Design a protein around this ligand. Structure first.
Ligand SMILES: Nc1ncnc2c1ncn2[C@@H]1O[C@H](COP(=O)(O)OP(=O)(O)OP(=O)(O)O)[C@@H](O)[C@H]1O
Ligand SMILES: [Mg+2]
Length: 842
């Protein structure tokens, strides 16, 4: 009984009228009752408490006297000092209160029955109390809130508007908001960087087709058996205490894995490709969240003995290690050591084993008579890199007698890119579920890429477009790719443009950070050193120079594939080692840390580093092959690439930037100093088809300036220039304004102006054009200063020199105006107007 359906016919409208919020509520409520939600009238917390008493007493087969119930309420149910996070902890972890009654007996009081999900009572109430809302109670507790909006209303603006007491509502797990035509859900979390519209979600079928309109959503997501599985089994509450509600493709993959295990086991058809299967979830879509989740759920199968969750040590980071520490303590790190693996194996009242592919491979190599070999075993592999994985297969196939193995990847191995390895199909069998890039991009769950070769160094162009790889390896030296001029010019470009690319320009904007991925240890050395030196140079010249905080990490290697780097620092050549040494020292001074380069220190440096790049304590991380495949940083938006990336490694590295965040993060910038255009298209095309590139890759500067049609959608989009010109035709102020309808129009228009500028901020052509608005002239030392920093012709100079932009002041007159009109919310009709909330606040 899958909860993400293969098939669903659309409900028919009544109708039976359906404009008004109270129209939507009437039907929602009616529909929910048909589906077996008892409707109750509740007017007060007091009435809710009593209802909870009735429900929990029923659930738990026990009656409180009033003094106990008061005590239960004050100490567990509804502590005055609990907040949302505490209730979520209670729903997800501490849902049993071991209660001691007046007569001194001890009894487990469950808020939810998780084993017998359908035993839970579900009920609905309406808003008690100017806002229509329906709440679903589970055993009396409010866990879902549906916010209802007029058909007119732009869901996003409504979301923008809303997102103790009365204190029971601290239990909400899930929000749904709907204007009838559209319906999105999102988790109730206090974590503000999970709180933007980007994290709201549509319900869907297993082919990922959306289910948008409320009646269909009701009849699907809101089946008791669906809703309660979502709440209880398909929401994650992790170690940073973030509630994440799984998206449909995540649940669809997960349930399909579990059912596959069960039917295999029942068929006694273990230990072949047809016993398991694979999951093609595109890079960044939550493979690691989902696969881990599915391993945890798999432990609940009584007949499975042990569940291995296996990750690649390459993919580890701080959040992720924190998370595994709870299930397999000090056993999931970068080392070859198995001692910890083999100790977790011998724990009992235990079924989950998390480990790396390196470790599992070592263990099975060494190791011949493990009881686990004869047990009923599940393997879930999260994106394991292709070669470590291959030796592991040989032994696992050799050695486990009864297993069901599954893999998640965003970049499968097909016959075409096989060479070396077994295809993914051949290893795992059937594709159980797919959610591919064009899917994720249509759903706005992954960001597009803006990819440009920074072709601005003629001296070195011929190197930078070289295709033969023998030559490319031959050129990794100071004569060629690490010529100190090349390194300088590139590094200068990066210092000149970091703030522009990461949107730290018109600050106090927070903005983003960045990585620089390079071809070799030496490259990283040259770049680190050059950054250091070039920042000393600014620091004297200027002196309100605000330095970027740069760091680097690497060790030792040794297509498609990003080279695996060891965590055994003693493999490195003496000079590499000493440089890493001096960098760690500098890092130690700055952050008051105390790492070293012995293996334990390096591992800890690695771990602190991930944390600090995630939280932007570091501005630029320089890297050879590390943090390129698994590292999760939503506020990283720019990859600088001086590296020969191809195929799956290309897709992975670029994807470091692809995490959604908010309206401020429009796509990931990829700025390359070798020409990666062919490679980029070949890679995208390998993992889609011939059209896939037009969905993944952003449009040209000229297209955002002058207008185009999104072939995906086909939305015609203006035209920053069209926009700017409309603003001036329509709207030079303040008399331009001042009828309400004109205000509406301005808001819509200046909305687009804001979206367009924000997009354009990521184009060198634009940053260049903007800079030219100073200067002048003379000038004309600072004429020359500017030509040289934006790499601009005389020729080009004269061009740019009027394209015409609106004055800064004229803009801040629009701005505050704009803001003005927003604050006086709360003819003419205002339903469909979205304000650029995120972009403003920036
Ligand atoms: N259902 C969800 N709800 C909220 N946030 C999510 C959800 N799924 C993923 N995310 C967030 O998206 C980001 C990517 O998740 P994750 O790292 O598991 O993706 P991935 O596919 O493993 O990426 P990679 O391919 O780089 O390993 C994380 O910050 C994660 O918390
Ligand atoms: Mg991952």
């Amino acid at each position: 009984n899958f909860i993400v359906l293969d098939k669903y016919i659309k409900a028919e409208p009544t109708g039976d009228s359906y404009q008004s919020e109270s129209d939507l509520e009437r039907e929602l409520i009616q529909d929910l009752r048909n589906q077996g939600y008892e409707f109750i009238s509740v007017k007060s917390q007091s009435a809710m408490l009593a209802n909870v008493r009735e429900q929990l007493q029923n659930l738990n087969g026990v009656v409180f006297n009033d003094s106990e119930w008061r005590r239960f309420t004050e100490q567990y149910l509804d502590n005055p000092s609990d907040g949302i996070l505490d209730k979520t902890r209670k729903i997800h972890i501490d849902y049993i209160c071991d209660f001691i009654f007046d007569d001194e007996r001890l009894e487990n009081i469950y808020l939810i029955d998780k084993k017998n999900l359908m035993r839970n009572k579900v009920q609905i109430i309406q808003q008690f109390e100017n806002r229509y809302d329906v709440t679903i109670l589970v055993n009396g507790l409010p866990l879902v809130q549906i916010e209802l909006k007029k058909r007119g209303v732009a869901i996003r603006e409504a979301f923008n508007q809303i997102h103790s007491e009365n204190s029971l509502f601290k239990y909400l797990q899930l929000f749904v908001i709907s204007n009838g035509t559209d319906t999105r859900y999102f988790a109730n979390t206090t974590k503000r960087d999970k709180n933007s519209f980007d994290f709201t979600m549509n319900w869907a079928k297993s082919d990922n087709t959306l289910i948008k309109d409320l009646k269909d959503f009701t009849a699907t997501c809101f089946q008791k058996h669906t809703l309660l599985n979502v709440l209880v089994n398909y929401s994650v509450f992790d170690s940073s205490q973030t509630l994440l509600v799984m998206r449909p493709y995540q649940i669809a993959a997960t349930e399909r894995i579990l059912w596959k295990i069960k039917s295999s086991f029942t068929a006694k058809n273990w230990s072949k490709p047809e016993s398991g299967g694979y999951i093609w979830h595109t890079t960044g879509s939550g493979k690691t969240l989902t696969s881990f989740k599915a391993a945890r759920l798999a432990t609940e199968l009584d007949f499975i003995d042990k569940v291995f969750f296996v990750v690649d040590r390459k993919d580890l980071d701080y959040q992720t290690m924190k998370e595994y520490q709870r299930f397999s303590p000090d056993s999931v790190n970068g080392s070859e050591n198995t001692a910890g693996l083999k100790r977790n194996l011998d724990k009992d009242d235990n079924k989950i084993i998390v480990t790396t592919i390196q470790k599992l491979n070592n263990l099975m190599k060494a190791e011949s008579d493990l009881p686990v070999y004869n047990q009923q075993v599940v393997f879930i592999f999260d994106e394991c890199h292709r070669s470590q994985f291959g030796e592991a297969q040989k032994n696992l196939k050799k050695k486990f007698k009864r297993y069901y193995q599954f893999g998640f990847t965003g970049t499968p191995i097909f016959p075409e890119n096989a060479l070396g390895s077994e295809t993914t199909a051949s290893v795992f069998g059937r594709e159980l579920h797919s959610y591919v890039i064009t899917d994720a991009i249509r759903d706005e769950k992954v960001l597009k890429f803006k990819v440009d070769y920074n072709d601005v160094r003629p001296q070195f162009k011929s190197l930078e477009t070289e295709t033969d790889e023998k030559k490319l390896s031959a050129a990794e030296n100071q004569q060629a790719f690490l010529h100190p001029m090349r390194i300088q010019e590139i590094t200068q470009y990066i210092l000149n443009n970091f703030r522009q690319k990461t949107h730290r320009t018109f600050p106090g904007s927070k903005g983003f950070n960045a990585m620089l991925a390079v071809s070799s240890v030496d490259a990283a050395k040259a770049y680190y050193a050059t950054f250091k030196r070039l920042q000393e140079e600014a620091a004297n010249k200027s002196a309100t120079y605000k330095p970027l905080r740069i760091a680097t990490i690497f060790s030792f290697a040794a297509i498609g594939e990003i080279s695996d780097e060891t965590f055994d620092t003693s493999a490195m050549d003496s000079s590499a080692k000493e440089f890493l040494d001096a960098a760690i020292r500098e890092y130690n001074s700055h952050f008051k840390t105390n790492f070293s380069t012995d293996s334990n220190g390096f591992q800890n440096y690695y771990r602190d580093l991930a944390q600090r790049v995630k939280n932007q304590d570091i501005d630029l991380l320089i890297v050879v092959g590390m943090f390129l495949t698994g590292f999760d940083a939503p506020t990283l938006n720019t990859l600088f690439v001086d590296k020969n990336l191809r195929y799956h490694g290309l897709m992975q590295a670029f994807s470091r930037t692809n995490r959604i965040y908010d309206a401020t993060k429009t796509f990931g910038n990829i700025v390359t100093f070798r020409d990666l255009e062919r490679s980029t298209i070949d890679a995208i095309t390998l993992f889609g088809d011939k059209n896939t590139k037009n969905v993944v890759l952003e449009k040209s500067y000229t297209e955002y300036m002058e207008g185009f049609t999104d072939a995906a959608t086909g939305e015609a989009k203006r035209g920053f220039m069209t926009v700017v010109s409309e603003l001036e035709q329509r709207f030079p102020d303040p008399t331009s304004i001042e009828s309400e309808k004109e205000k509406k129009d301005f808001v819509k228009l200046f909305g687009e102006y804001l979206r367009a500028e924000n997009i354009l901020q990521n184009y060198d052509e634009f940053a260049t054009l903007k800079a030219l608005q100073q200067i002048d002239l003379s000038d004309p030392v600072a004429v020359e200063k500017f030509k040289a920093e934006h790499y601009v012709d005389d020729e080009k100079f004269a061009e740019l020199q009027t394209i015409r932009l609106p004055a800064d002041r004229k803009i801040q007159d629009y701005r505050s105006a704009y803001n003005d009109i927003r604050d006086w919310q709360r003819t003419t009709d205002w339903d469909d107007v979205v304000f650029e909330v995120d972009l403003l606040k920036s």
